[PDB]
Design a protein around this nucleic acid. Structure first.
Lengths: 161, 161, 161, 161
DNA sequence: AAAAAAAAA
DNA sequence: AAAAAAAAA
DNA sequence: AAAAAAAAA
DNA sequence: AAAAAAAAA
């Protein structure tokens, strides 16, 4: 069944969590198997309430596709990226909620800021969580994401015995 | 049985697909096992017909060997490579069909063009599919190909328990 | 059960050993599984007594977290790092024992010195083991640690079949 | 049982083959397991007789340890290394046979020469096989060796389920 | 014997 | 449908 | 709760 | 046929 092993970073103003969501397959009637819904690396941001305590109730999610992951793992020290998502895309509720994830180098080069911005035009809200990530932490993510990439793409099914 | 989990890139004029084809083994009569036919990373190109629709019927294939894969994964941002294949090599139908795959940096350095050219002297045809690949996409391929390399070489059979 | 396969470096004044300690999980009552205690890469230092012989009785341990590992694997040739640990942290016996691990480039750039310093204010002792590590050896550690990182984080549980 | 999946390079004057030899373990009476004899990446060189044919009878072997592998995978384009081995080391027949493997950059930077030199003072012979390796081929070896490194060290036994 | 804790299904 | 072959247990 | 879709065995 | 040894559960 499920497995819950997130890599988490807890900082002053918010927490950040990351974990793979594996792809789903379908057993063709030809006998073989076929990849159905794509894996992602799910990012969870949540707010620090009171003192070193965190409000899981107010979390926001951002799903990194294979291609966004490749974008993060191939980032230089001075590079930055920005991803834009609509959860209710190609559906009835589109344009209402808008998420943007930005990864920017801090001035020192000592790391990066990762922030999730959520604008909800239905509930008339505007949230923003930012978490600083050291060079070491981002190194864990780079290495963990690279490990995970083949798996969310379903390439770990190509094995000899 | 089979597993179908291609990494695909869909662009203006054509689509590109990539997936490992595992090596085949033979159970020696000595008891052990021996690698028989070599794995490849198969590339499939196909043409965009009408509007964001793609003509799977007109696809062309290109099989990357272990060594060609090593050539792609070790490419710098400014490097380019070109591979030349005859499907009916060392057989009766050689010289008739000629395939060439070129990976070139786009001017921006924002990625690469991958194109397959097929010249068929039997059917008197000349096809060319080109697909632009961003830095992020080519990063997925590099990471996915590196993951896959040991597997198509059959080295995933060397495992402790 | 247990598995004992340390990578070891034996030098003039001391020995150094490194091996992963896997994370522990808990089978939720929801059916799924949940990561409980975190994996580390355990480092063991011990003193050379007499001539090319080593006093296992006087060993000192240092547990690298996921994040410390990411710090070591992402070190340039000229970089150095220093980690500080209190084994009896957040408990009753804190402040008494203090461990610090330093990884510094040797002058040549031919490698690094890895040293563990242990100050025990209970037993009134002060130990220091230093082991030089060549570029090749540190390359084994970098590659072995990167391989191990996903595993100590419990990400090897996310697998397709 | 055995598995035979060598990566091979066939050139003008000789052939080169490479494959992992896994470590051996012992089931402790404590229940757990303990690594016994170390894995290597075995290199096999053999001479080209006549025209594109190769004399397997005259092969010479060279066993790369974990540390030698780390030395090869961390080589820059312009780096070179040289390893020296006595097969009958610490035994009665030492000093008699002497093997040396050299990896040097070719002038172009288009690759490397890998050569095995064997001097046998018992049989009064002196053999030398040299095989040029392109950047692509050496990229396969680097990637395949890095994949294999954890395995020959027995670290693939540290797995979650 | 090991630096811990912070959300949660 | 795929570029092959070269040593061998 | 998650940005989707495009070929196909 | 292979470069070995050094601590230990």
């Amino acid at each position: 069944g499920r497995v819950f092993a997130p890599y988490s970073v807890f900082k002053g103003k918010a927490a950040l969590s990351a974990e793979p969501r594996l792809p789903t397959f379908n057993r063709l009637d030809s006998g073989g198997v076929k990849l159905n819904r794509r894996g992602v690396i799910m990012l969870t941001f949540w707010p620090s309430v009171g003192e070193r305590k965190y409000d899981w109730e107010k979390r926001q999610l951002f799903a990194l596709s294979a291609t966004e992951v490749g974008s993060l793992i191939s980032m230089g020290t001075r590079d930055s990226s920005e991803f834009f998502h609509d959860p209710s895309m190609l559906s009835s509720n589109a344009g209402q909620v808008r998420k943007s994830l930005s990864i920017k180098p801090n001035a020192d080069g000592s790391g990066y800021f990762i922030s999730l911005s959520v604008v909800n035009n239905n509930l008339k809200t505007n949230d923003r969580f930012t978490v600083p990530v050291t060079t070491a932490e981002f190194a864990v993510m780079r290495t963990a994401f690279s490990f995970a990439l083949p798996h969310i793409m379903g390439w770990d099914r190509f094995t000899n015995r």
